[PDB]
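Q: Give me the 3D complex with A1IAU.
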Amino acid sequence: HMHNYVIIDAFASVPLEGNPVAVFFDADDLPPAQMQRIAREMNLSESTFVLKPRNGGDALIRIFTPVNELPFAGHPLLGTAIALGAHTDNHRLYLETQMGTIAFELERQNGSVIAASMDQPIPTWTALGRDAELLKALGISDSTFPIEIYHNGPRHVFVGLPSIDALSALHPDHRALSNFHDMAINCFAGAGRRWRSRMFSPAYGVVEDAATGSAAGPLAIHLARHGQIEFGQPVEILQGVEIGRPSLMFAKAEGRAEQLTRVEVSGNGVTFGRGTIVL
Amino acid sequence: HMHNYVIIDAFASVPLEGNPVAVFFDADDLPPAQMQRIAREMNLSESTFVLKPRNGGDALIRIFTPVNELPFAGHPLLGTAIALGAHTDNHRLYLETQMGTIAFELERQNGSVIAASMDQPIPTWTALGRDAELLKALGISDSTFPIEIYHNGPRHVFVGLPSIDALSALHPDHRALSNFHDMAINCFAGAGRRWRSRMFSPAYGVVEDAATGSAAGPLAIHLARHGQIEFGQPVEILQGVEIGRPSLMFAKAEGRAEQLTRVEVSGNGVTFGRGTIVL
Ligand SMILES: Nc1c(O)cc(-c2cccc(O)c2)cc1C(=O)O
Ligand SMILES: Nc1c(O)cc(-c2cccc(O)c2)cc1C(=O)O
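A: Here is the predicted complex, encoded as structure tokens.
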């Protein structure tokens, strides 16, 4: 009859930064066709719906873009975990998804969840094999590191820039980027612990994304494989600066390329708004 | 510090139909840069902000897409008027905008505003002069009536189809439509009092719009000029059927082509949700 929701800015501690997600509570009475229509009404990159668990977790989360359901998504799940922390006392939260149960660690101050860390699906990867085409679309001549495409649900391509200023100077041809289907293009630069990223994806319906949580795990793997960090070392990834939505993602990939044991992504989140819908 | 808002589905009486707009109340403390960031956060086609009047109206309304401020907009202003009716008793509402003061008549049942009628800016028009290009993009060979482009703030082109089934069968090339800048393409079919429309606008950031209120006045003028209705006769325009967002717009253009005295557009509206933001 009515549902409460919150809008969480994921990968931010300040409202209007990070990447929004709408989280709808007590959604068991909504058929998925209605969830999809609600996600379309809200028009945020994702709306999530909190449901009773079916396999021993704390809750089952269904994730919708304005057009389709997703089996996994990075910032939407982080924001959902932070939102649900307002309704539980547990330090760990186990959220069921189409792809299995994702474990979260919740960080609180005086009962308010301010951040969370999630274990991500372990990616696979290969060479993109379309380098000249992609580089032309981005407006540059070469990448620093190999142009590889990672799969953990979505697909994320990584193109390296020689400096943060070169990354900020990119002005991609978005029409040309639209020939890259079912993937996002992540451009990065930095050194040591601190990296900057920009993400562009016509395929996922975003000219430039603020905080691509599902790309943070893959980027940590990419940087470790290519010798810029070690496996087991965390990185800080700052995204969305150029578009006025700065977002901080932390990532770490444990093990070795051939036997990854854990891919962790963490971030702050903050409530932008709260409301109730009439169905 | 905090602001209340509502989500109104304009040109509908049932939630999840029509065209959403977010309406923020008591917005005088928000600088326009912050209004723009809020509109971007919400990501609805428009968010509006209710401000104290400056020229004798009931309120001043500022209208933002996720990217820029607009001087006028059809469904956003209808939805704002219906939303503000919850806070006033007056039968008429005078809303100041960048383009002057727009008069609304509010229709209530037991204190709830269920519909409103607005006087629109009087359009101007001319031939598009790009017929072959536009028809190719739409996938058809010819229009029924002359292909003319109307200006009332936005620009709206009208292409006529020989039957409602031919209108539903359109599958436009949206890449080709993107070469039509600063305008929307409205395709229509029908007879007598009852017309169907579909609107496509890469320029205004919408693949297919549910209810193009600023096009309804122009369509009434177009139909009267081309002899399908008389000036002074109202039409019912049903839009958004193919995309699952049916929307009913009523329109009437009084006078004659050379001396239009009033362009009225009316519709139902309904509250989808209500909430509060943290700034
Ligand atoms: N924002 C996203 C989006 O629009 C799409 C996907 C995606 C796409 C294909 C398969 C899949 O499992 C997920 C992921 C995200 C995300 O945030 O991770
Ligand atoms: N949805 C709209 C949109 O995205 C843009 C405009 C527009 C564009 C240019 C000039 C202007 O005055 C208005 C109007 C609307 C609307 O709803 O009427």
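A quick observation: DSSP finds six helices and 17 strands in chain A.
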